[PDB]
Design a protein around this ligand. Structure first.
Ligand code: F2N
Length: 643
């Protein structure tokens, strides 16, 4: 399944047209189904050609010469399919050699705000489509939230660092195009408690199994018993979790109660049984006395005998039904149900898994929408997640080649009228001087964190619509930070990619909870997640580094941990050009706000467009999602301005 593999790798069903294709090829969708079969094959075959060699441009001509008969005969259809794929960035995207050099005459002028992956991806597209495009970047570097520290042989990422599984991922293509070195993340992640001692394989697996059950339970509560609203306020994932933990504690307590009752019932039956046995002894003594007096005794002894014995066929008979209790009893007081749901240490290890989830969503669990936090799960790529061994910055740096990028240029105002656009920016090195860039269309790739900023960092004239600003306000924008520790010696386990540090309280579970071993040089990355991420931004590098060394010394022993030669600490929330790490579906929002974010603002025809990780519903908060959003908008614009 080569052509089949291609559809897959492009995130398309290999045997049916998508709604997009139906819209663009209405004559094929509503027409002979035999012609649809041909369409799909032409489409899957062109994707294959491009994906097999993403380093070179795939022209309309070269596609025609490589299709086999009878397909290479339908010149018009092939062209219609090739243009559609190219326009929408499914082929000829990223960085590749042009065999058809760009035309000197550039049609339409577009200003892209932001030189991060979404902006660079869109930039290159628009440029290859023959448009005039300039990017205005506030930082003194490209990449935005993809940031790599490089000094000597030290390489460490302060922004994105993980690639999520190649099958279906457009980064698979970019990876080959920029020669980026990827390494699969080894699953083994040892956990150490606050005292520095490892958590036993047993408990590790047990708590992780509870973590999974607890989550599955919230999913059931949400998508089945529709428990998504309480007191008119939407329910958060954190909220649902604590409720499910409570029910578990209640159940444990209930089985504890029932058991104690079995003990007490058995204990009463015994006490009562002992008491009548004592009375039967007192009844037997009444006989092993009296019994012995006269001459009729040959009948009086027989009598007192078959009498005194019958009271033993009674007594030791009770000692029997007595042994069946002491047995039942000792068996119960030896097999008690669980005393608690989670011990105090167990709850700490569980909190580690929760911090892990707060890392992934870049936000405290109490802020996540119980119903839509994992709204995009259905679009995951297949395969192992990888790590970028040579620094993820190699991507935006390569995507920047040949583009007109203006660094240290912070946009402060965006005016869009029914007949053109003006973007006002200021040099960040001399806020004295401003710049005024005229253009036909503005592509805003500003982070949702900047768009939420109050007072506003950039102004919109006219102001953006209420349906757009309301969406910006509902959506969540998280935070996540890393501490890069650069040493001259490796004192950790070189075979382990990651290891965890379990925190002492629920509140600080996200403080330096996960360490990463990813690079050539002796470097360790420590994560700060959930509630701890924003707070820690207020502590200086030195103090924060200190706390890392302490954790580290508690695990490998002091004297094993030397002082770092170099350290880098991110503070994404404080970063004016970001205002956080990435979006998350907040409670009260949903995947529809990601769609609304993508909507262009048009006063008589579309003028203001949007891209960036917060504008792609099926791939939010990711580097690839940022890439696709870029390709998406370059398409939407070329359609408006070039047709
Ligand atoms: C900050 C951050 C972000 C991410 C991560 C860690 C951290 C600490 N990574 C993760 O830890 C994992 C995430 C993850 C998520 C999902 C699955 C698996 C993992 C991570 C991860 N994503 C991913 O796929 N794998 C990852 O490994 N993210 C998120 C991505 O970094 C992010 O979604 C993506 O880079 C966003 O790109 P955009 O183009 O949408 O935004 P940005 O790069 O910020 O571009 C905006 C530009 O605008 C510029 N700018 C601003 N204000 C102005 C102005 N006024 N004028 C002119 N220019 C301006 C600003 O400086 C930027 O250059």
């Amino acid at each position: 399944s080569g052509v089949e593999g291609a559809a897959f790798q492009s995130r398309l069903p290999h045997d049916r047209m998508t709604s997009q294709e139906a819209a663009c090829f209405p004559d094929i969708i509503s027409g002979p189904q035999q012609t649809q079969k041909v369409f799909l094959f032409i489409r899957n075959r062109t994707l294959q050609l491009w994906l097999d060699n993403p380093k070179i441009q795939l022209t309309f001509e070269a596609t025609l010469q490589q299709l086999e008969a009878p397909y290479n005969s339908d010149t018009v259809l092939v062209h219609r399919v090739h243009s559609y794929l190219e326009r929408h960035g499914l082929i000829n995207f990223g960085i590749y050699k042009r065999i058809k050099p760009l035309p000197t005459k550039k049609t339409g002028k577009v200003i892209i705000i932001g030189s991060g992956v979404s902006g660079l991806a869109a930039a290159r597209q628009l440029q290859s489509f023959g448009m005039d495009v300039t990017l205005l970047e506030a930082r003194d570097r490209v990449g935005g939230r993809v940031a790599t520290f490089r000094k000597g042989n030290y390489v460490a990422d302060l922004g994105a660092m993980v690639v999520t599984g190649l099958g279906g991922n457009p980064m698979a293509v970019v990876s080959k195009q920029v020669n980026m070195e990827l390494a699969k993340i080894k699953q083994k992640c040892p956990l150490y408690e606050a005292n520095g001692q490892a958590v036993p394989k047993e408990k590790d697996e047990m708590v992780e199994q509870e973590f999974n059950r607890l989550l599955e339970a919230t999913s059931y509560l949400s998508h089945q018993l529709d428990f998504n609203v309480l007191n008119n306020k939407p329910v958060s994932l954190g909220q649902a979790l604590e409720v499910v933990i409570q029910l578990q504690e209640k159940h444990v307590k209930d089985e504890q109660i029932e058991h104690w009752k079995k003990i007490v019932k058995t204990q009463e039956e015994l006490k009562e049984l002992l008491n009548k046995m004592v009375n039967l002894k007192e009844k037997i003594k009444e006989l092993h006395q009296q019994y012995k007096e006269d001459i009729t005794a040959e009948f009086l002894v027989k009598s007192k005998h078959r009498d005194l014995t019958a009271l033993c066929k009674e007594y030791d008979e009770l000692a029997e039904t007595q042994g069946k209790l002491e047995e039942k009893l000792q068996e119960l007081e030896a097999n008690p149900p669980s005393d608690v749901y989670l011990s105090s240490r167990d709850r700490q290890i569980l909190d580690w898994h929760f911090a892990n989830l707060e890392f992934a969503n870049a936000t405290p669990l109490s802020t996540l929408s119980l119903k839509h936090w994992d709204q995009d799960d259905d679009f995951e790529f297949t395969g192992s997640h990888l790590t970028v061994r040579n620094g993820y910055s190699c991507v935006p740096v390569a995507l920047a080649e040949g583009l007109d990028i203006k660094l240290n240029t912070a946009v402060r105002q965006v005016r869009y009228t029914a007949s053109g656009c003006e973007v006002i920016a200021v040099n960040t090195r001399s806020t004295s001087q401003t710049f005024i860039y005229k253009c036909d269309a503005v592509l805003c790739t500003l982070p949702l964190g900047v768009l939420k900023q109050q007072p506003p960092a950039v102004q919109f004239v006219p102001p953006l619509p209420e349906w757009k600003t309301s969406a910006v306000q509902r959506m969540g924008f998280g935070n996540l930070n890393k501490v890069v520790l650069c040493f001259d010696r490796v004192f950790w386990d070189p075979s382990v990619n990651l290891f965890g540090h379990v925190g002492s309280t629920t509140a600080s579970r996200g403080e330096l909870f996960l360490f990463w071993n990813l690079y050539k040089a002796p470097i360790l990355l420590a994560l700060v997640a959930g509630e701890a991420a924003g707070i820690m931004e207020n502590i200086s590098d030195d103090v924060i580094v200190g706390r890392c060394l302490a954790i580290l010394k508690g695990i490998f022993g002091s004297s094993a941990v030397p002082q770092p030669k170099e350290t880098v600490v991110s503070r994404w929330r404080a970063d004016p050009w970001a205002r956080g790490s990435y979006s998350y579906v907040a409670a009260g929002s949903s995947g529809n706000d990601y769609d609304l974010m993508a909507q262009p603002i048009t006063p008589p025809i579309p003028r203001l467009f949007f891209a960036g990780e917060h504008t792609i519903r099926n791939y939010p908060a990711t580097v690839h999602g940022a890439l696709l959003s870029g390709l998406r908008e370059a398409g939407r614009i070329a359609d408006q301005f070039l047709g």
